[PDB]
């Protein structure tokens, strides 16, 4: 920051100097008529250079030296410590005529040096460091830097109809733990010279994305910037001082909002009461509002929201106790984080947040329900790494006039960025959800997961062996022989295997999977009036994954032995990998990724 | 592209194979009840591998070999040249039971290999190369790649009320020179197997950004994709074939449109007449729509739009013959480019294009007029390079309730990206334009330019020397002595010098300038009723820059000699750098940067 401060003909000019800047001072155009030359004195804590045509040249406090007055001869003025009274530090310039060794005129510059810094935790360790030089940027990765801000979308105070960020008030110091800290640090004399004030400010646009709070009597809570407050004039305190503000996020990254926001402080010179002039200094900090993050099946379960055997299966973990209403995610900053639940178009408590997106022109379908919303385990895809996974959403083809999740949920999910969503084809299903045909399961040593796919061809292959084994009479009276000889039903399932393979191909491509990673599970569909699939027997892939325990729907199909040839087959596949199958809607809150989302690389 | 193609129990499956992909074929789940093992034959141009648990293993066309039937035993099928009749190439699989050395059943795969490529000039040399592997991306810089598309914002046909891109019709082959070429290249037998078609398509959203044209009888011009045409079914021609399409841009990069657009081709399998199934293949090309670019003063003039001495000054260049209505820019692709004029809220000819942006809710001010719109010479700013310069726009401070150029022109200018706009402070001026206080001028050997700034302090410094020289009577009867002793007027100009220095500081910072690069020109302002500045004498910095000839307003102030102490002073500064001053609204169309905008680096 090089800033212009001209000397004024015959006058003494008072200026405030902010440490970290330097002044360029025109001496020439202040010089009286007929001067040929100037000297200068300057005080201890002012560094002064004289500068002709690039050629810098420092000067002592006391020298009697003269130079030749030219427009190419200017000064550069620095100061290296704040002032303890106003003025005191100074630079004075003498102008001497052709001979005359007494100055004809003089011009001065009376400086008060102050330090002003607007500080945040840009290095992301939870401590608000002193003027991080990257605080005005935001970059990704471990070596990256820039401060993070949560949406205050929980509720500290239960009497309250809405989430904290919904008002412009704070009713509890518990709240401030959800907020990011920003400290205005100043260092100067005991009052500002006349006609200066310090003003925090934000843009009209950011004014619905942030709220800033001052803690008075640290106690009362003052809303200074935010909704309908774009600026706040700050009381300067002298000497070394710190003001503490608390910043809350109000909106998630979304269509038309990247999640970056700015807060500024200006030292504004005035010409009067009102008549503001120009900022003589500005400092800026950036916050990135932290995205909403979903949790996959490979992540350890903490609590299962659910009659009888759901409870009994969960006693083998240390979990507590519709899938279509709710998706559990979280939000995380270096300081704080907490579960936040997305709501399909009120567990709203302390440290349990809430988002919805309601359509406006558009209307909801079955594809909006959050069984149509899943996320992979972490993956690498041609080198790019997805440490938090990829969100998966069932769709229809774009020209097919079929169904689609609302744009407003879709844009929301895209806007979060860190789980780079992938669209699948679920609209061949009557309900239309990705959870009807695919699931992930961890392999309990690793680090490594499996994709489970429904497969009609595996089902026909299984039955043709059973009919061969003579279990064709194994059972409105449904036997294998009965199904196998149903030609019409066979066609439908060839068409459904086609839909399943389309998705198989997307999933492999976008999650970097191979056939090694995929288990096909036998499954069978009947075509409804719309030509869409609905399950024929209980849909086994549509399970609960409580670690290594799998809560798999009970098939009850054409059976043999004292159990079933489907429960034997599915047990045969999963159990030899580590996984304990229990055969029996639910919805499991999980442990966050230990992986911090801000370390993610572009 | 790995794609799924299952064998079908007992059946022969016909498939189309697109070169560049590979198939994964499940053999297991097709195998009859009781098989233990399979062999396979395959034709010459089919490459087949057998794959157990990762372990690939190629197989000959004729071998009698058996393998053990398992779900982990699949095939991988490739083909390396197109087919000349349908089927012909094939893979057949034999299934043998426990002993029996004659196959019990068999399943086949009858492949027709075709080549389909949607091709563009992604390497940016004007020739449409064969399947550039980066054609589906767009990257910046010299080593960067991705195809470029002009907005067709000129007019080939003058009877027409609007610019070409405004309809969905082409009335002249001249037009196609403004368009980008895209070639669907196919290679296959003489007909497609039954139930396949090729479909070009675009998104609803891109459908108002692109128009695509087919030249029939190469002649008639067919609109295939664009406004209200999202898809086009293409006639396959057999053998080695090329279809040529022409693509026109319709909209400039803008708020909410990055300037990237996509066009796709799918091979779509059908189950019937209608009943489309799934794309078995998709190829995608990306275009970046080329931005609108402004031209600075250091660039050579081609024609001056203007009573008497404007004409006489221009005869010293080889130029042809309000500044507030119009800004000359251009647009450039590797193939084509042409001047386009931005219109403040009809030189619309062949190779002379047009854009406007009209506000909607907002209304115009003086700051909308394009004297409030300039651009620097190329600059480097802390390493970042601005090879085309930076657009400069006069503004007011954000909290000041002052004037501002319309958001819609501002967003438009930002959206173009390559001249990263900078806002200045012009609202202290009655009119409010950047051209009232600053100009650039080339230094005629280089490569190097100067910033000229209006300066009230230089003016007072000049007069104080004239009054000293006793020219205080040099001249409603205005003399130097008269001005100097006007105290009220002195104050106003101290305040205006303050506004000028604010801008000086922005300009230095954002154009990486130093005092070395700046000439202050003497200037004087009177404060109007709104406290805003209007010039006192003719505003000299507000000049025409026709190379080394400067067309400088004639000052006519307090004079001496047979001319003026202001025309002597300004001549004294400029002429010793190379520049021929002529003292005398205009608007000069210039030579584009030789620098291609796509080579610019992020
Ligand atoms: C170019 C690819 N692309 C861009 C990425 C797409 O967006 C895309 C679009 C479609 C699609 C499907 C569709 N339809 C009507 C579906 C058929 C399958 N669906 C069924 O309802 C269905 C499913 C199975 C059945 C049954 C109907 N009837 C029978 C008898 N079966 C059956 C099948 C097997 C066994 C037993 C029964 C669901 C809707 N209609 C249209 N129309 C758009 C079109 C113009 C047009 O024709 N408009 C009326 C024609 C296709 C060309 C683009 C222009 N597109 C399909 C795949 C796609 F990739
Ligand atoms: C914090 C910095 N910032 C964020 C980046 C800004 O956007 C910013 C805002 C202003 C600004 C100017 C302004 N005004 C009224 C201008 C005074 C200069 N202008 C004149 O019209 C003008 C100029 C010269 C004159 C004369 C009036 N009257 C006289 C006598 N002179 C004069 C001066 C020298 C010689 C002779 C005459 C033009 C408008 N009014 C308000 N109001 C906003 C505010 C609330 C408020 O007071 N609202 C009513 C107060 C400032 C604090 C933020 C809240 N802001 C100025 C600089 C800024 F950088
Ligand atoms: Ca820190
Ligand atoms: Ca609140
Ligand atoms: Ca809270
Ligand atoms: Ca909380
Ligand atoms: Ca879900
Ligand atoms: Ca090329
Ligand atoms: Ca047209
Ligand atoms: Ca044209
Ligand atoms: Ca043209
Ligand atoms: Ca202009």
PDB file of N, CA, C and O in Angstrom, chain B residues 377-401:
ATOM      1  N   UNK B 377      -3.389   0.266 -21.172  1.00  0.00           N
ATOM      2  CA  UNK B 377      -2.447  -0.609 -21.858  1.00  0.00           C
ATOM      3  C   UNK B 377      -2.146  -1.877 -21.080  1.00  0.00           C
ATOM      4  O   UNK B 377      -2.425  -1.980 -19.883  1.00  0.00           O
ATOM      5  N   UNK B 378      -1.531  -2.874 -21.743  1.00  0.00           N
ATOM      6  CA  UNK B 378      -1.129  -4.100 -21.054  1.00  0.00           C
ATOM      7  C   UNK B 378      -0.290  -3.781 -19.825  1.00  0.00           C
ATOM      8  O   UNK B 378       0.475  -2.828 -19.839  1.00  0.00           O
ATOM      9  N   UNK B 379      -0.458  -4.563 -18.764  1.00  0.00           N
ATOM     10  CA  UNK B 379       0.254  -4.316 -17.523  1.00  0.00           C
ATOM     11  C   UNK B 379       0.559  -5.647 -16.838  1.00  0.00           C
ATOM     12  O   UNK B 379      -0.124  -6.647 -17.063  1.00  0.00           O
ATOM     13  N   UNK B 380       1.562  -5.617 -15.952  1.00  0.00           N
ATOM     14  CA  UNK B 380       1.798  -6.687 -15.001  1.00  0.00           C
ATOM     15  C   UNK B 380       1.658  -6.118 -13.599  1.00  0.00           C
ATOM     16  O   UNK B 380       2.184  -5.052 -13.314  1.00  0.00           O
ATOM     17  N   UNK B 381       0.968  -6.864 -12.734  1.00  0.00           N
ATOM     18  CA  UNK B 381       0.601  -6.394 -11.411  1.00  0.00           C
ATOM     19  C   UNK B 381       0.944  -7.504 -10.410  1.00  0.00           C
ATOM     20  O   UNK B 381       0.158  -8.428 -10.169  1.00  0.00           O
ATOM     21  N   UNK B 382       2.144  -7.386  -9.832  1.00  0.00           N
ATOM     22  CA  UNK B 382       2.669  -8.354  -8.889  1.00  0.00           C
ATOM     23  C   UNK B 382       2.862  -9.704  -9.577  1.00  0.00           C
ATOM     24  O   UNK B 382       2.733 -10.747  -8.940  1.00  0.00           O
ATOM     25  N   UNK B 383       3.218  -9.681 -10.866  1.00  0.00           N
ATOM     26  CA  UNK B 383       3.420 -10.921 -11.597  1.00  0.00           C
ATOM     27  C   UNK B 383       2.249 -11.248 -12.521  1.00  0.00           C
ATOM     28  O   UNK B 383       2.465 -11.571 -13.687  1.00  0.00           O
ATOM     29  N   UNK B 384       1.009 -11.171 -12.016  1.00  0.00           N
ATOM     30  CA  UNK B 384      -0.126 -11.376 -12.900  1.00  0.00           C
ATOM     31  C   UNK B 384       0.031 -10.422 -14.074  1.00  0.00           C
ATOM     32  O   UNK B 384       0.472  -9.293 -13.905  1.00  0.00           O
ATOM     33  N   UNK B 385      -0.320 -10.909 -15.260  1.00  0.00           N
ATOM     34  CA  UNK B 385      -0.173 -10.149 -16.482  1.00  0.00           C
ATOM     35  C   UNK B 385      -1.546  -9.917 -17.077  1.00  0.00           C
ATOM     36  O   UNK B 385      -2.352 -10.840 -17.168  1.00  0.00           O
ATOM     37  N   UNK B 386      -1.732  -8.694 -17.559  1.00  0.00           N
ATOM     38  CA  UNK B 386      -2.955  -8.262 -18.190  1.00  0.00           C
ATOM     39  C   UNK B 386      -2.598  -7.840 -19.591  1.00  0.00           C
ATOM     40  O   UNK B 386      -2.466  -6.648 -19.860  1.00  0.00           O
ATOM     41  N   UNK B 387      -2.388  -8.830 -20.491  1.00  0.00           N
ATOM     42  CA  UNK B 387      -1.945  -8.573 -21.858  1.00  0.00           C
ATOM     43  C   UNK B 387      -2.867  -7.742 -22.730  1.00  0.00           C
ATOM     44  O   UNK B 387      -2.446  -7.303 -23.787  1.00  0.00           O
ATOM     45  N   UNK B 388      -4.117  -7.560 -22.307  1.00  0.00           N
ATOM     46  CA  UNK B 388      -5.108  -6.795 -23.061  1.00  0.00           C
ATOM     47  C   UNK B 388      -5.492  -5.525 -22.286  1.00  0.00           C
ATOM     48  O   UNK B 388      -6.355  -4.733 -22.694  1.00  0.00           O
ATOM     49  N   UNK B 389      -4.888  -5.370 -21.109  1.00  0.00           N
ATOM     50  CA  UNK B 389      -5.172  -4.212 -20.287  1.00  0.00           C
ATOM     51  C   UNK B 389      -6.237  -4.487 -19.233  1.00  0.00           C
ATOM     52  O   UNK B 389      -6.634  -5.634 -18.986  1.00  0.00           O
ATOM     53  N   UNK B 390      -6.671  -3.406 -18.583  1.00  0.00           N
ATOM     54  CA  UNK B 390      -7.735  -3.505 -17.607  1.00  0.00           C
ATOM     55  C   UNK B 390      -8.755  -2.412 -17.882  1.00  0.00           C
ATOM     56  O   UNK B 390      -8.383  -1.285 -18.127  1.00  0.00           O
ATOM     57  N   UNK B 391     -10.032  -2.793 -17.963  1.00  0.00           N
ATOM     58  CA  UNK B 391     -11.096  -1.822 -18.090  1.00  0.00           C
ATOM     59  C   UNK B 391     -11.199  -1.001 -16.815  1.00  0.00           C
ATOM     60  O   UNK B 391     -11.079  -1.550 -15.726  1.00  0.00           O
ATOM     61  N   UNK B 392     -11.484   0.297 -16.983  1.00  0.00           N
ATOM     62  CA  UNK B 392     -11.557   1.273 -15.897  1.00  0.00           C
ATOM     63  C   UNK B 392     -12.936   1.926 -15.938  1.00  0.00           C
ATOM     64  O   UNK B 392     -13.369   2.324 -17.011  1.00  0.00           O
ATOM     65  N   UNK B 393     -13.643   1.968 -14.797  1.00  0.00           N
ATOM     66  CA  UNK B 393     -14.962   2.588 -14.739  1.00  0.00           C
ATOM     67  C   UNK B 393     -15.097   3.465 -13.508  1.00  0.00           C
ATOM     68  O   UNK B 393     -14.781   3.091 -12.388  1.00  0.00           O
ATOM     69  N   UNK B 394     -15.591   4.668 -13.758  1.00  0.00           N
ATOM     70  CA  UNK B 394     -15.807   5.622 -12.694  1.00  0.00           C
ATOM     71  C   UNK B 394     -16.990   5.193 -11.851  1.00  0.00           C
ATOM     72  O   UNK B 394     -18.018   4.795 -12.393  1.00  0.00           O
ATOM     73  N   UNK B 395     -16.824   5.322 -10.532  1.00  0.00           N
ATOM     74  CA  UNK B 395     -17.887   5.019  -9.602  1.00  0.00           C
ATOM     75  C   UNK B 395     -17.948   6.054  -8.471  1.00  0.00           C
ATOM     76  O   UNK B 395     -17.255   7.083  -8.488  1.00  0.00           O
ATOM     77  N   UNK B 396     -18.832   5.756  -7.503  1.00  0.00           N
ATOM     78  CA  UNK B 396     -18.909   6.438  -6.224  1.00  0.00           C
ATOM     79  C   UNK B 396     -18.676   5.400  -5.154  1.00  0.00           C
ATOM     80  O   UNK B 396     -18.807   4.206  -5.420  1.00  0.00           O
ATOM     81  N   UNK B 397     -18.411   5.844  -3.930  1.00  0.00           N
ATOM     82  CA  UNK B 397     -18.199   4.902  -2.839  1.00  0.00           C
ATOM     83  C   UNK B 397     -19.514   4.184  -2.553  1.00  0.00           C
ATOM     84  O   UNK B 397     -20.613   4.713  -2.780  1.00  0.00           O
ATOM     85  N   UNK B 398     -19.432   2.932  -2.071  1.00  0.00           N
ATOM     86  CA  UNK B 398     -20.623   2.097  -1.950  1.00  0.00           C
ATOM     87  C   UNK B 398     -21.657   2.557  -0.930  1.00  0.00           C
ATOM     88  O   UNK B 398     -22.802   2.167  -1.064  1.00  0.00           O
ATOM     89  N   UNK B 399     -21.268   3.327   0.101  1.00  0.00           N
ATOM     90  CA  UNK B 399     -22.202   3.689   1.168  1.00  0.00           C
ATOM     91  C   UNK B 399     -22.653   5.137   1.021  1.00  0.00           C
ATOM     92  O   UNK B 399     -23.438   5.636   1.826  1.00  0.00           O
ATOM     93  N   UNK B 400     -22.166   5.784  -0.034  1.00  0.00           N
ATOM     94  CA  UNK B 400     -22.258   7.219  -0.205  1.00  0.00           C
ATOM     95  C   UNK B 400     -23.582   7.614  -0.852  1.00  0.00           C
ATOM     96  O   UNK B 400     -23.782   8.795  -1.113  1.00  0.00           O
ATOM     97  N   UNK B 401     -24.427   6.631  -1.187  1.00  0.00           N
ATOM     98  CA  UNK B 401     -25.603   6.863  -2.005  1.00  0.00           C
ATOM     99  C   UNK B 401     -25.300   7.566  -3.335  1.00  0.00           C
ATOM    100  O   UNK B 401     -26.215   8.014  -4.022  1.00  0.00           O
TER     101      UNK B 401
END
